[PDB]
Amino acid sequence: RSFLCKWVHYWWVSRDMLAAGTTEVDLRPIQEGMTAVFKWRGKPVFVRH
Amino acid sequence: EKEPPHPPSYPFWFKSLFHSHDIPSVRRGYEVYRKVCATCHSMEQLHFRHLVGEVLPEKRVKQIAAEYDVTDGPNDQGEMYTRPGILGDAFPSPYPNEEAARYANGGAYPPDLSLITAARHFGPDYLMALLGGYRDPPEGVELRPGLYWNVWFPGNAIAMPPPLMDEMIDYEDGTPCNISQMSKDVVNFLTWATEPTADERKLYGLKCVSAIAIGTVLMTLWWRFYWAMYATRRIDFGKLKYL
Amino acid sequence: QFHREIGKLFASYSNKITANSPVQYVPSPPTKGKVRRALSSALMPVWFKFFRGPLDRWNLAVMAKYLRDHGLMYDDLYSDKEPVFARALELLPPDIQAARFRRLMRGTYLNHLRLYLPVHEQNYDPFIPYMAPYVEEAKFQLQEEEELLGYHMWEGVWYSGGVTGFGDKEPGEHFLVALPNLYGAGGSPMQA
Amino acid sequence: GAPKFERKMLGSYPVSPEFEMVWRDRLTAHGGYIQQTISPYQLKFIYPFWHTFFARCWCKCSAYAWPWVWPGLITFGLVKKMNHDVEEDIRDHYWY
């Protein structure tokens, strides 16, 4: 059982990834009717005025 | 060429089969490395992530990483920029490429220390001996400028200057500083950095080997159980002898 | 005509060999040339006293003790994976055959235990030649078959009957004729 | 395997596939024999091993002395003499 558990665990995500983080966005340059796009935790985020 | 000598065995806490690393020594060795040896060497495989929980508390490690400027980008204009280091970044390096490193060190290349004790014979004993090894030339030998005599380096002539000097650094736990102490602590730190998974490996080893040995005893008994029935058999020819 | 010409070569050589045939027994020519016979004869007094003598005595001591520990004879060391000896064993009489069977059993058991026999069980000569009269007959019988049947490289049908076709007479003894069946229960050659 | 005159059976019942190897190696019991065995649940099985230990060990060690150890000793000798030769060379060639 220990062997199989280690072998399964070895396919799991690595210890460098961690998916942690936070970000901030300045909204002065945006114009009405426009959609801006940003990067966040590996996925895209839309901000629309 | 010649066979180089072999170093003496020092009693580092870890080189027993039941012992772990010695974490205060590791902290002090890291401090030495930062203040001295990181002037010309690099550890490209290490990230600050590695220090939290294993050596240092997270808060302090973040504050350490914040001391460096680390390059990042491109930005909206396609330019690169510098930012304060974060926990996710690798250790910084003093030279941009091997050519610059050789240019600053008279032609010789300072090796990357990420695996140094696994990349030499007798590992930490060799490193401990090497850091002690600087001495005056013998009769009949002279070395060209920017080259030094060391009794443990192969061929005895080495490009690295004498490495250590008393109270060139200071400790936060209070321990007194001298070249011998610094040698011990930095060798401890580099031995840890060579494979941080050491203690995990050894503690798992112990359970594994113990259980497997108990296994072996049980299987030996089971094998003899069947050995005995044919080892003690009787076969007679012609007529029956005993019963 | 190439083939008949080389025929002529072969035939003349064979006729030479035939013409020199004796009509009665004549002693064989020595196995070593006169130079080596001279050298050996010269060096005998040192070589036999110091080296060959003790070698040939130590050898028999080693052999005898190993055979006596286990209670084997010398002619119990030959296998029946050897055709000549297989024939010889076929020609044996009941008593000799039974005793050989028994000795082999005991030797197997003793080598399993790794226990010496008592010295009073070891009082016999192990080097009696009890298989000789039968080995000579086997040699005769198996030589005549070569002479009368094996004198040419005979031609056959390939990979048919379970035999490769290049000479075998027992089925599936070679890899390319392994696995004779895919369904059913198989069978054995001895029950045909 | 076995010679054809040994692997000839007395019975005529078809040999089942799972017994192939068993009857390829058939041998006759010339003269017959009698055997007795005890179930391993009714035998001691670690005392018989130690009871016969000294005899077995004497036999095994006696058998291996000359063939394995004496050439071993000679080889160990040769290594020591090689070390001598080298440690003398290294001074002759390079020490003033």
Place this chain on the structure above:
Amino acid sequence: GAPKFERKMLGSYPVSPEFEMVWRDRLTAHGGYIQQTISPYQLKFIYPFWHTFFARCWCKCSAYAWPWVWPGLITFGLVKKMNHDVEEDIRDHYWY
């Protein structure tokens, strides 16, 4: 394969391995029969094909008409009507 009452042989010679499949599928010739064949070196072999072409082609094409073509025609119809519906939609929804 074959029923057991068909694959029962009259001979008793051992079936060789390379003929396995041949005798697993044995069948009886109920009533017997007579057959004749000519060596292919003594036959015409491309004229017999064209000589019987029209009959063979009539048979094959006749057999496939209803089952394959009529549903095919219906499907082709459906595709054309779908195209109609789409080309009308695209104007209704987006042209003023």
Place this chain on the structure above:
Amino acid sequence: FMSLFRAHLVFYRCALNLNSSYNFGFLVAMTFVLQIITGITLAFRYTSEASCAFASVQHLVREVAAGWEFRMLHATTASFVFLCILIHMTRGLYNWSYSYLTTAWMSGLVLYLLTIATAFLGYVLPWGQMSFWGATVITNLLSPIPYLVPWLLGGYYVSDVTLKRFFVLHFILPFIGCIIIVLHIFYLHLNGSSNPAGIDTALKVAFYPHMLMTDAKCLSYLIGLIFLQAAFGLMELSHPDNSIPVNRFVTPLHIVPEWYFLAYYAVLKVIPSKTGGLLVFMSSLINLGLLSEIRALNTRMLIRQQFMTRNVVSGWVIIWVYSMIFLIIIGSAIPQATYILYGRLATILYLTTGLVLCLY
């Protein structure tokens, strides 16, 4: 396939006096299966690029759960593969197994060649100094034929192309191994195993209860020892110098192959002509092959008892073993005249004692 399983591994009947020395085949097979498992799970995260192979192997150890364990099991089980094979070979030299197990002995030799090739291909994949310069040396050694070496390399020098094809070849060869193992066992069970006593006997006993348990016992010991060495590192089986990144214009100052290659290395140190070097390997392997038909090289009827117990004369196989060990010793040391001299002595012994096996 169950009926075959029962015929060969349950009802198969052995001789009563088969001791541990007959258990090492099973053991090498098991190290094969185990090495295959760890192989495949290492392939899932390895990178076959000269620019980054090294760091790819380091990533497993540093950043992957249980990453270190599979690499180290794979590294250490190789040594046991070779150790078990050598014990397994020497047993049959000692017994003269090849007298009647002719084709089994041939198959054995082919399997050993396969194993050498597999190991050496593996040895290049971590892509350190020793890997690069080892590949350089062995590719230069098979130079006699034009253009074959740039072709097999893929290039004028050892390259990323070379790494890619070495990786694929190292993937494939073990399974060809497995096929040849099936062939091996066919020839073996065609005949039947020999005794340590070298007699023919009717005192046979079935496999499943008695011998299966001995196999299992030895298996326990081997699993034990592999884990001991893997987890704690008792012996310095592999030199440190593969820990350094490659440099194409600077050799390492001291050189020591993996132990199972040292004897060969010793030869390349001591014979002057390079072709003589290569021919020694070819000749010794041909001599071993020649033992398959030793019954024909003489008209005296042959026996398997070599009467080596209590014998002051010892036997040619023992002298062979000690010569080989001496060659390993000399392999390990620096190039110096005296080492070369005793090297040549040992080499002559190693060659002669192999030639002489045919002279009964």
Place this chain on the structure above:
Amino acid sequence: FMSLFRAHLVFYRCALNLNSSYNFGFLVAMTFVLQIITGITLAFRYTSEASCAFASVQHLVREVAAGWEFRMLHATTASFVFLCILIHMTRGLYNWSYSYLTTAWMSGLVLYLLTIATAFLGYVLPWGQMSFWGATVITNLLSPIPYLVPWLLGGYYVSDVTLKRFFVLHFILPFIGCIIIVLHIFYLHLNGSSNPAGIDTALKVAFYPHMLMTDAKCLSYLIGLIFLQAAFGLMELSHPDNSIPVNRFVTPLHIVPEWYFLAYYAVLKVIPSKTGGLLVFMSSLINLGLLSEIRALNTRMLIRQQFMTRNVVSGWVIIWVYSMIFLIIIGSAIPQATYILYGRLATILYLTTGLVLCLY
């Protein structure tokens, strides 16, 4: 193994009236062997890194002798694999082969599943836009279970780790294929093939002279056609959009899978609930599996003649084929209400005509 060769491929006796429609199995096997050769020789130069896979495939075409030929043969032979498989399946739906070739039919289904998996894994390795977003979609489709998707990916999103393990899996699966093929043929020759007439007949004839030549003829045609399409590019089998490097934050504006996946795609377009989507595939495959024991679903004694010749009623298999082709058509087009409407009509036909096969 020669005796088996002769028993099964030389002396094996068939029915006289086996026409070309019974030659397509041999053909799919041959495309397998051929695809394996080209696979292995492509592996020698491919790079399994997300940073550089794409350029690795371009290097073969641009800078390697005959580099282009192996890539294009490998790409084009896949289409023929699937085309031959579909003809091979439809033949046995038409004949009701599964009436008595029960386990052969089951084995067939397993082989088809293996082939789908193999192809889709291959489709990701060139690492273009379509590859990345296809992998994203199919991995999201099997999401219902927690943590299974990050585990199988290796990561929170499609990554270099994903590429590495896809490459190894694509390496391995074909050979498992081969093993299952041997199993397939075992079940087949256990029974014996059916006629186009669906009667039992004694007018049998051996394989080697008559049927072997027809196999060879069709083989010539297939090799021909593969080379024609491979060298000249007559049909746009693969969409251009895999020619663009990957971008993780922008999808391609128009999407068309490989043709052998379009019908499935059509379903994912038209059924509202995602789970309903997945369940349609599961249900249809279960229905096909259920045909293996059709003799039990009724007490009337069964015949293999479906009397589809000259029949105005046609047959459920033909309606199935036309429904599937219609679904391919709709697969190919943009998402629009009318396409979805006729999609749903065709989907209902496709499901119902599969259910109804059991109702004799």
